[PDB]
Design a protein around this ligand. Structure first.
Ligand SMILES: OC[C@H]1O[C@H](O[C@H]2O[C@H](CO)[C@@H](O)[C@H](O)[C@H]2O)[C@H](O)[C@@H](O)[C@@H]1O
Ligand SMILES: OC[C@H]1O[C@H](O[C@H]2O[C@H](CO)[C@@H](O)[C@H](O)[C@H]2O)[C@H](O)[C@@H](O)[C@@H]1O
Ligand SMILES: OC[C@H]1O[C@@H](O)[C@H](O)[C@@H](O)[C@@H]1O
Ligand SMILES: [Mg+2]
Length: 580
């Protein structure tokens, strides 16, 4: 008996009418005295309905260009479905009923079956478009990933960016392609049996192109701020519906299988029903199998058990792994010792911090909560993602950091891809890509100069505003064909096949997973009715024979996969083996 707050009849923005009657334009404003829509260059006064709601129906169709005129000021539509001239331009009327979907036999994907592959549309291919990305779908299918995780697509200012400066949340970023190009990508993925997930940013709007305050200051509050402006006021129902209507668009109209909510700790809301719970309600009302994941650092199980999200990106595993391999201690890395015994504990507990003091300078508090309620798929683990590469001064990848060998990098992949937690890979990880993933942007005027200045001060650091920084982050596909890149890719293919085929690795219960260590050797054991597997990873500097590892059980005898393809059960420095 939850009832959606959304009715297509009353949808804000421009919505095609039935019977070829045209388009219904609607907006909410708390402050404008005169309100008009300017369609294909001609102004038309809109009808006041009360409650600050204004509406007009005209016989224009999909493809018509428009914006709203508030007290005589031409203002983009925050509910724009497409912005062909960018975030300060006219919107285009879009009809979601015109695309010929062929994915009727696709029925979504369960979290326990996801292996995510994080794509940044702009850098994933030379062209940096959806159409070019769709051409790599057969590669990803054969690689053995099962869900693409796309970085944010909401329109932002400039000709490249990561996506976190999105300002028009309903409008896919025009340089990547038109709406039907996005639909084509999703339909192609579904035809190959791949899920597609979208990163969405409901904690802030970017600095350029967010016109919501021009309509009603009360979308936002001064009670708290975001990175870019005033905080999003989730006590205001129109603000709540801006983001729940957006989530429903992506899932229903673009056929995404799920959403990754950026920075959920910063979605502040003191309402009786928290906005995260209402999002889950609103997406579930669609009657599909869509998932919601939270990017959340609080180690808070209530995201799943109270807000009814499906899982959480949980960085403790990533951080413990990077410190193990590099020894680094700057910033939040100071929260971790690293090492076999540390990694065994973090895996056992799902996350490390369950209420203990977080001693990181400038951040000290009792961090986290007991993870007992969560099951293995609820934790999303990685050793690389956009932030854990791009937030480094030079954007270098894990195998490119000082002191990391390709053998250790290959071992880390084995640990990630045999655990029952839900893994995520970053584009190009699988072939130990040679290119960095740096922070790049393309803001105009003084804002652009401020970004460049802010990056320099925070940490030669590549200028985010420079074209070269974007281009240096482009994937080089040809390199995967040779050398150590090809060797790494063969290993990733082998690991993903094992994950898919091995009956014991199908385990998704923490009850069946144990971990421990002997010196610098980590072991992870899975036991189910199908048998036993043990992953051993030598995190030492020396060679270790499997026979000589002290274990509280009898080690399995059969060598299933060795990360350096050795015939004997011996581990060189940084190497791993799976036995059964
Ligand atoms: O303050 C947030 C919540 O804290 C508790 O819930 C966490 O800790 C419990 C045991 O301390 C776990 O059982 C639970 O799964 C965790 O989310 C508290 O029990 C909740 O009511 C609070 O909302
Ligand atoms: O060598 C001095 C450091 O020794 C320890 O750090 C090493 O050993 C950890 C496992 O105990 C690894 O995770 C880490 O990468 C190594 O650098 C110690 O923890 C450090 O505080 C010392 O500076
Ligand atoms: O991963 C733990 C870290 O999460 C970050 O994204 C938080 O902003 C930071 O303050 C914390 O140290
Ligand atoms: Mg020992």
């Amino acid at each position: 008996s939850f009832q959606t707050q959304h009715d297509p009849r009353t949808r804000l923005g421009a919505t095609p009418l039935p019977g070829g009657a045209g388009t219904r334009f609607r907006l909410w404003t708390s402050t404008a005295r005169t309100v008009a829509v300017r369609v294909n260059g001609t102004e038309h006064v809109m009808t006041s309905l009360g409650g600050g709601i204004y509406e007009l129906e005209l016989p224009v169709g999909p493809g018509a260009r428009y914006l709203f005129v508030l007290d005589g000021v031409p203002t983009p539509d925050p509910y724009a479905r497409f912005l062909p001239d960018g975030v300060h331009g006219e919107a285009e009327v879009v009809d979601f009923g015109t695309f010929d979907w062929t994915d009727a036999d696709w029925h979504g994907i369960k979290l326990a079956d996801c292996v995510f592959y994080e794509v940044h549309v702009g850098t994933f291919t030379p062209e940096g478009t959806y159409r070019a990305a769709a051409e790599k779908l057969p590669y990803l299918k054969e690689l053995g990933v099962t869900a693409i995780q796309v970085m944010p697509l909401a329109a932002f200012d400039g000709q490249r960016g990561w996506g976190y400066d999105g300002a028009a949340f309903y409008a896919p970023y025009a340089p990547y392609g038109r709406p039907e190009d996005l639909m084509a990508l999703v339909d192609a993925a579904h035809r190959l049996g791949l899920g597609v997930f979208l990163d969405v940013v409901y904690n802030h709007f970017g600095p350029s192109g967010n016109y919501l305050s021009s309509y009603a200051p009360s979308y936002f509050t001064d009670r708290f701020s975001s990175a870019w402006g005033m905080g999003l006021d989730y006590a205001e129902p129109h603000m709540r519906r801006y983001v729940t209507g957006n989530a429903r668009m992506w899932l229903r109209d673009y056929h995404f299988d799920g959403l990754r909510l950026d920075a959920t700790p910063y979605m502040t809301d003191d309402s009786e029903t928290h906005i995260l719970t209402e999002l889950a309600q609103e997406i579930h009302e669609l009657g599909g199998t869509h998932l919601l994941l939270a990017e959340d650092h609080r180690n808070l199980p209530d995201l799943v058990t109270v807000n009814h999200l499906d899982g959480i990106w949980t960085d403790d595993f990533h951080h413990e792994t990077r410190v193990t391999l590099t020894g680094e201690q700057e910033g939040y890395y100071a929260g971790y010792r690293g090492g076999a015994e540390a990694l065994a504990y973090t895996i056992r507990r799902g996350w490390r911090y369950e209420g203990q003091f977080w001693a990181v300078k400038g951040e000290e508090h009792e961090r986290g909560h007991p993870s007992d309620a969560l099951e293995a798929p609820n934790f999303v683990y990685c050793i690389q993602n956009h932030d854990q590469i791009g937030n480094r001064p030079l954007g270098e990848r894990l195998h490119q950091s000082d002191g990391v060998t390709l053998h250790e990098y290959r071992g880390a992949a084995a640990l990630l891809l045999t655990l029952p937690m839900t893994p995520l890979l970053f584009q190009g990880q699988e072939w130990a890509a040679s290119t960095p993933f740096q922070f790049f942007s393309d803001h105009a005027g003084e804002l652009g100069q401020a970004v460049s200045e802010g990056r320099k001060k925070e940490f030669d650091v590549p200028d985010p505003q420079a074209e070269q920084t974007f281009l240096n982050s482009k994937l080089n596909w040809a390199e995967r064909e040779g050398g150590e890149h090809a060797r790494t890719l063969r290993l990733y293919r082998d690991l993903l096949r094992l994950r898919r085929e091995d009956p014991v690795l199908h385990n998704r219960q923490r009850e069946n997973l144990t971990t421990g260590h002997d010196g610098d050797v980590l072991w992870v054991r899975t036991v189910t009715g199908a048998g036993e597997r043990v992953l051993l990873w030598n995190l030492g500097q020396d060679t270790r024979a499997v026979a000589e590892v002290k274990l509280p059980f009898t080690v399995p005898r059969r060598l299933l996969l060795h990360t350096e393809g050795r015939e004997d059960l011996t581990l060189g420095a940084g190497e791993a083996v799976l036995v059964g």
